[PDB]
Amino acid sequence: RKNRAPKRTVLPDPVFNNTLVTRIINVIMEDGKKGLAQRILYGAFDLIEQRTKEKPLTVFERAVGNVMPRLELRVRRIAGSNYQVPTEVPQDRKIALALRWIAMFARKRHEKTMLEKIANEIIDASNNTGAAIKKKDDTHKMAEANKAFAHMRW
Template identity: 50%
Template sequence: MSRRRAAVKRDVLPDSRYGDKVVTKFINSIMLDGKKSLAETIFYGAMDLIKEKTGQEGYEVFKTAIDNIKPQVEVRSRRIGGATYQVPVEVRIERQQTLALRWLTTYTRQRKEYGMMEKLAAELIAAGNNEGATVKKKEDTYKMAEANRAFAHYKW
């Protein structure tokens, strides 16, 4: 982290099929070893699978899932007088999106289905219906913030 000036935010190009920057960010988070075309194949294949399974447009399910996963509050560690408190704080819009994409990628990889395309489709459908591991992660974050609400006055 630079001490002189704030880091410049790099902007990503919108994806080719939907023209959405969030989709590009998600494809980049799926990508391993720089294999972007493989990550795009996985994502767009999952969108087609969602359309087959649910009958809804895959992109709409993706947007709904991201909205269901985004956390509004989280806890941050704050050291005060020798004790460390978990202080609940509101989450900025950019961080909400980043956390949602990160959790979605992490819990998609942990699923038991065969193949990343099937895993991603299943996790997006579950998150779109407000269930699944990613939504559970968000709820656990909320429970932690609620349990530590007494320390909210330590916000900075």
């Protein structure tokens, strides 16, 4: 019966001083190693740089912040069915899912180099066009039939 427990998160990168990009490195690394992911990610900050003149800090923050939920549909089952009760989702899991969704969407639209696509997805999440904002949208819009579930506890 696991209870509240801490997490190990690498401290912010000296060149940008953001802990969020560090969790991105934590969760993007191919073959489970940073010996190779960091080069291309710094390239991506560069690609963001000469494309649309977006400084990585503000564009990355405005991309990650707009994909973040506020509702925890806590599971409660009947052993033959299941339902969800809406509580407040934890803030640590808030930022965790935000960064995970940003990273996992960041690497798609298979094309000539991953630099162009990752900068493209950073820009898309920056401009609030539908590529990862849909996560935040659904986490509140599908909690409407589940909003009825907030009238009772089971």
